């Protein structure tokens, strides 16, 4: 293949959207503080959220590293910042469920999901993919517990 918008144009939009809103790397000490490093690649994402009730009030992502990691976290935490715990647990319940079923999203909203899965498989990109993946699922947990 010469040109394919499979991942290139996808993360292109992911980082460009992140540039239209130039905010990244922050720390909110309140309720949940979960950071995830990739000491091989240099990525470091400190996910500091504030869930004040049964929702998500805010989230600060101190994400450093490469193009995908700091961007994906910012994108998924933006959706989380505007969600609840039920909706977050559901999003991750289906997020993991996709891997058992085949390929499907209840909302069809696979913008980051298809980007994160793209790098998920390359030996060098898998640890940056699992980085954002495991860090987000670890923040508020997933499904109804995960464990």
Annotated binding site for Zn(2+): 41, 43, 66, 128
Q: How far apart are CA 72 and CA 104, in angstroms?
A: 19
- 43 versus 112: smaller Cβ distance to Zn ion: 43
Site map (CB under 5 A) of Zn ion, residues 3-32, x = contact: ------------------------------
Using rule CB under 5 A, residue 45 touches Zn ion:
no
Cβ neighbors of 91 (< 8 A, separation 6 or more) are: 79, 83
- Residue 65 contacts Zn ion per CB under 5 A: yes
CA–chain centroid gap for 4, Å, is 23
Does 41 sit near Zn ion (CB under 5 A)? yes
Calculate Rg over the CA atoms of the chain. Answer: 15
| Contacts for 103 with CB less than 8 Å, ≥ 6 apart | none
Contact of 102 with 66, CB cutoff 8 Å: no
Residue selected from 33, 55, 66, 94 as contacting Zn ion according to rule CB under 5 A: 66
Stretch that binds Zn ion, among 11-19, 52-60, 105-113, 122-130 (CB under 5 A): 122-130
Residues that bind Zn ion (CB under 5 A): 41, 43, 65-66, 69, 128
């Amino acid at each position: 293949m010469s040109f394919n918008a499979n991942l290139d144009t996808l993360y292109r939009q992911v980082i460009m959207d992140h540039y239209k809103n130039p905010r990244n790397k922050g720390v909110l000490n309140d309720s949940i503080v979960v950071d995830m490093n990739n000491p091989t690649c240099g990525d470091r994402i400190r996910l500091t959220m504030k869930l004040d009730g049964d929702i998500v009030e805010d989230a600060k992502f101190e994400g450093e590293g490469c193009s995908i990691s700091m961007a994906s976290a910012s994108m998924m935490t933006q959706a989380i910042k505007g969600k609840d715990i039920e909706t977050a647990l559901s999003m991750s319940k289906i997020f993991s469920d996709m891997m058992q079923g085949k390929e499907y999203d209840d909302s069809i909203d696979l913008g980051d999901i298809e980007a994160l899965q793209g790098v998920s498989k390359f030996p060098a990109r898998i640890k940056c993919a699992t980085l954002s993946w495991k860090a987000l699922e670890k923040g508020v947990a997933k499904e109804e517990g995960g464990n």
